Design a protein around this nucleic acid. Structure first.
Length: 106
DNA sequence: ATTCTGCATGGATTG
DNA sequence: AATCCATGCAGAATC
């Protein structure tokens, strides 16, 4: 159960827009590498083992890339998360299932 | 009249 | 001193 990264949800991530940005460094060290901009359907599951499915994609951004998970709103809702709170990611050694954790802020 | 969508921009933040 | 990333935004769909 290797843990990978953490990200405090900003207003845009926790809002209903539907897109949680991933830190470029994080998304590139820990999520599958993506060649094309459309990206990969990425299957995470939460602490209750419910499998949610996001779209892991990027956009161009000053010749760099900007990585984002789309489709996040119902899952974040299900954790009763809001901005300030932090979301976390981990992996499981066999099969590499990516697991989403969260913790609320003080 | 409201949500997708595919990016830009510039204060932060990092190197 | 360079490149993030939180969010603005303008057009296309959609209510």
């Amino acid at each position: 159960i290797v843990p990978l990264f953490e990200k405090t949800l900003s207003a845009s991530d926790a809002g209903r827009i539907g897109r949680l940005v991933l830190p470029k460094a994080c998304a590139e060290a820990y999520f599958p590498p993506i060649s094309q901009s459309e990206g990969i359907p990425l299957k995470i599951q939460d602490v209750r083992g419910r499998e949610w499915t996001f779209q892991f994609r990027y956009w161009p951004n000053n010749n760099s890339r900007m990585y984002v998970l789309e489709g996040v709103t119902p899952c974040i809702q299900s954790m009763m998360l809001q901005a300030g709170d932090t979301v976390t990611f981990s992996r499981v050694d066999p099969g590499g299932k990516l697991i989403m954790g969260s913790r609320k802020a003080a």
